[PDB]
Ligand binder design. Structure first.
Ligand SMILES: CCCCCCCCCCCCCC(=O)O
Ligand SMILES: CCCCCCCCCCCCCC(=O)O
Ligand SMILES: CCCCCCCCCCCCCC(=O)O
Ligand SMILES: CCCCCCCCCCCCCC(=O)O
Ligand SMILES: CCCCCCCCCCCCCC(=O)O
Ligand SMILES: CCCCCCCCCCCCCC(=O)O
Length: 567
C-alpha cells in the first residue's frame, strides 16, 4: 500500500481510492467517502513514512476500510454481508455488489459559468465530488482510466474557465470528454461482454488482431504473449477487483515497456510516462509503421504445402498467426474485419483441408468482406461530407428509423446522434484509420444500443444483430433493411405539436427536438422518399426560421401538408 501510494502519488492515490470507494460504496454520500479517503491516505502515509505499522504489511486494507462504512447495513444490505466473510471470499463478495448500470440520476452538467466558479472556489471539492459521482455511476469502469478523464476534465476546466466564451470553449471539450468517457465506459463493458458472450478464443483473436495492428514490427510469438497477458488483465478488469485488474494491467504495461524493441517504436512516449498512465498510453499507442517490404499472405496461407498441416496442428495459433499477419499488414482494417477474414479463412480451411486438393480450394473471398465496410465508410463519409454532422445524423435517423422503427424515439435519436458523432470523429480520420476508428466508436454505440435493448427489447431484427457474434453485430445492423412488416404508428399530434421552444433553444437541444420529430414522422410514414423527407425538412426549415403565434397555425399547415404528401 506504501509502494502503491509512492508510484501513483498522493493526488492520484486519493483520487483512485475515492473512485474505488465510490465504485464499491455507491450509496454513502461524498463526505463519508472523503472521511474514508483522508483516513486511508493518512494510513497510506503511515506506511510511506514508516511501513512499521502492523496494519500496513492492498486487497485486505481496501476490504477492511469498506467494512468501516456504518451505513453498509442500512443503505447497501446485501453488499455489507461480505464483512462477515474472511478476505479470499470477502473481496470476491464485495466485487459482486457493484452495480453495472446502477440507475442513479442522470448527472446534470451545470452551466459552464457555474462549474467554473465551483472549480475556482474549491476545485478538488468540485472535481472530486463529480469524480465520485461519475465513479459511483460507473463502478466497473477501471479506476485509473476514469482518473485520466478527471485529469482531462480538470484540464478542460483549467483551460476553459479562463477563456473568452467558456460555453464555446468548455461545452465542446466537456462533450469530447463525455463522449470519449461514454465510449471508454462502453468499450470496457464490450471487452468484458466479449470475454463472456463470445468466449476467451474470440477475445484472444480480437486481442491478436488489435495487438498485431498496433504492434506490427512485433513477432507473432511476441503478439501471442501480449494477447494472452491482455486476456488475463481484461479477465481481471471485467471481474471488477480493480486492485488485481490494475496490478495485472501494470504487470503487462511494465512487460510491454521492457520489450519495446520486440513490440513497437511508438511505445517510447508511454514507457517514459508513469505507472498510473503507462497502461492507458500503451492502450492508446499509435500503430507502428509496418516493416519495409513484407510479403502478401498468399504465400504462407494459400500457396504453402504446410497450410493445412500447420492449421490442423494448432487451429487457434495458426488462425492467430493468420490474423496476426493480416492485422499487421492491415491496421486500416477494423479488428472485427480482421476477425471476419480469420473466421472466413477458418471456414474455408475447415472445408479445404477435408477437400481432396486443399491448395486449389484455398483470399479472393476476403475482397467482398473487406470492401463492404470500406464502401460503408466511403458512402457514410461521403454522406457526412455532403451533409455535415447534424444533417448526417438525420440521414441516419430516417435510415435507422425506417429500418427498425419498433425501437423507441429517444434511443433512435441518441443512437443516430452518437452514430453521427462516430461519423464525425472517424470521417475526419484518414481512409486508412477510418474503419478502425469507426469499429471502436460504432461497436460502443451498438453495444450501448444492445444494452438499451436489454430490459427494453422492441425488435426481433436488432436483437438478432445483438445476439449475432462480435464480428457480425455491425454487418447485421448494416444488413437491417426497412421494416415492411412495421405497421406505421398512428398520427400523434403531441409529438408534432411544436411549442415556441425551438427558436431560443441552443442548437443541441434544438437538433434533438427536430430529430425527435423526424423519427416520429418516419415512424408515422415509413414509406416516404428521401425527396419527400427533404420536402418536409425544408417545409420545417422555412417554417421555423420565418417564425409564438406562428408555431400553432403555420406548424399545423406543415403537419397536414406532410400527412397528405407522404401517403
Ligand atoms: C470524470 C470526473 C470529472 C470531474 C469533473 C466533472 C464536472 C462535470 C462536468 C460535466 C460532466 C459531463 O460532461 O456530463
Ligand atoms: C488505494 C488505491 C489503490 C489503487 C489501486 C489501483 C492502482 C492503479 C495502478 C495504475 C495502473 O496500472 O493502471
Ligand atoms: C498495457 C496494459 C493494458 C493496455 C492494453 C495495451 C494493448 C494495446 C492495444 C489496445 C487494445 C485496447 C485497450 C485494452 O486492451 O485495454
Ligand atoms: C468471433 C469470431 C472470431 C474468429 C477468428 C478466427 C481466428 C481465431 C484466432 C484465435 C487467436 C488465438 C490467440 C493466440 O494465438 O494466442
Ligand atoms: C436502433 C437503430 C439501429 C442502428 C444501426 C446502426 C448501424 C451501424 C453501422 C453503420 C451503417 O451500417 O450504416
Ligand atoms: C408531420 C411532420 C412534422 C415533423 C417535421 C420534422 C422535421 C425535422 C428536420 C428538419 C430540420 C430543419 C433544418 C434546420 O433548421 O436545421
Amino acid at each position: 500500500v506504501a509502494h502503491r501510494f509512492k508510484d501513483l502519488g498522493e493526488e492520484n492515490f486519493k483520487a483512485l481510492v475515492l473512485i474505488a470507494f465510490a465504485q464499491y460504496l455507491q450509496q454513502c454520500p461524498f463526505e463519508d467517502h472523503v472521511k474514508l479517503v483522508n483516513e486511508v491516505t493518512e494510513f497510506a502515509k503511515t506506511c510511506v513514512a514508516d511501513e512499521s505499522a502492523e496494519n500496513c504489511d492492498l486487497h485486505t486494507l481496501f476490504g477492511d476500510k469498506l467494512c468501516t462504512v456504518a451505513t453498509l447495513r442500512e443503505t447497501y444490505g446485501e453488499m455489507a454481508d461480505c464483512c462477515a466473510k474472511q478476505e479470499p471470499e470477502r473481496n470476491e463478495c464485495f466485487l459482486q455488489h457493484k452495480d453495472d448500470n446502477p440507475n442513479l440520476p442522470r448527472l446534470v452538467r451545470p452551466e459552464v459559468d457555474v462549474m467554473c466558479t465551483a472549480f475556482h472556489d474549491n476545485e478538488e471539492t468540485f472535481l472530486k465530488k463529480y469524480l465520485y459521482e461519475i465513479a459511483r455511476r460507473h463502478p466497473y469502469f477501471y479506476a485509473p482510466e476514469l482518473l485520466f478523464f478527471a485529469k482531462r476534465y480538470k484540464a478542460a476546466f483549467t483551460e476553459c474557465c479562463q477563456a473568452a466564451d467558456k460555453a464555446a470553449c468548455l461545452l465542446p471539450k466537456l462533450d469530447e470528454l463525455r463522449d470519449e468517457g461514454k465510449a471508454s465506459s462502453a468499450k470496457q463493458r464490450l471487452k468484458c461482454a466479449s470475454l463472456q458472450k463470445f468466449g476467451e478464443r474470440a477475445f484472444k483473436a480480437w486481442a491478436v488482431a488489435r495487438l498485431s495492428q498496433r504492434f506490427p514490427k512485433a513477432e507473432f510469438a511476441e503478439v501471442s504473449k501480449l494477447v494472452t497477458d491482455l486476456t488475463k488483465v481484461h479477465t481481471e478488469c471485467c471481474h471488477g477487483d480493480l486492485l488485481e485488474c490494475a496490478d495485472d494491467r501494470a504487470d503487462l504495461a511494465k512487460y510491454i515497456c521492457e520489450n519495446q524493441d520486440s513490440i513497437s517504436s511508438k511505445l517510447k512516449e508511454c514507457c517514459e510516462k508513469p505507472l498510473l498512465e503507462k497502461s492507458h498510453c500503451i492502450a492508446e499507442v499509435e500503430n507502428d509503421e509496418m516493416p519495409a517490404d513484407l510479403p502478401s499472405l498468399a504465400a504462407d496461407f494459400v500457396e504453402s504445402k504446410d497450410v493445412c498441416k500447420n492449421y490442423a496442428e494448432a487451429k487457434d495459433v495458426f488462425l492467430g498467426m493468420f490474423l496476426y499477419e493480416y492485422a499487421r499488414r492491415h491496421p486500416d482494417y477494423s479488428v472485427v474485419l480482421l476477425l471476419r477474414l480469420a473466421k472466413t479463412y477458418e471456414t474455408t480451411l475447415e472445408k479445404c483441408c477435408a477437400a481432396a486438393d486443399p491448395h486449389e480450394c484455398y483470399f479472393d473471398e476476403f475482397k467482398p468482406l473487406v470492401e463492404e465496410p470500406q464502401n460503408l465508410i466511403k458512402q457514410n463519409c461521403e454522406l457526412f461530407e455532403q451533409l455535415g454532422e447534424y444533417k448526417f445524423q438525420n440521414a441516419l435517423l430516417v435510415r435507422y428509423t425506417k429500418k427498425v422503427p419498433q425501437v423507441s424515439t429517444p434511443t433512435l435519436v441518441e443512437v443516430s446522434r452518437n452514430l453521427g458523432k462516430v461519423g464525425s470523429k472517424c470521417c475526419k480520420h484518414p481512409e486508412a484509420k477510418r474503419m478502425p476508428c469507426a469499429e471502436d466508436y460504432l461497436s460502443v454505440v451498438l453495444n450501448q444500443l444492445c444494452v438499451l435493448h436489454e430490459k427494453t427489447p422492441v425488435s426481433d431484427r436488432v436483437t438478432k444483430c445483438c445476439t449475432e457474434s462480435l464480428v457480425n453485430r455491425r454487418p447485421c445492423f448494416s444488413a437491417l433493411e426497412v421494416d415492411e412488416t412495421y405497421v406505421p404508428k398512428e398520427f400523434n399530434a403531441e409529438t408534432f405539436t411544436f411549442h415556441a421552444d425551438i427558436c431560443t433553444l441552443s442548437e443541441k437541444e434544438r437538433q434533438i427536438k427536430k430529430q425527435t420529430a423526424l423519427v416520429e414522422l418516419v415512424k408515422h410514414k415509413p414509406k416516404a422518399t428521401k425527396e419527400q423527407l427533404k420536402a418536409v425538412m425544408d417545409d420545417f426549415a422555412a417554417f421555423v426560421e420565418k417564425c409564438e403565434t406562428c408555431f400553432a397555425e403555420e406548424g399545423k399547415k406543415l403537419v397536414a401538408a406532410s400527412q397528405a404528401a407522404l401517403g
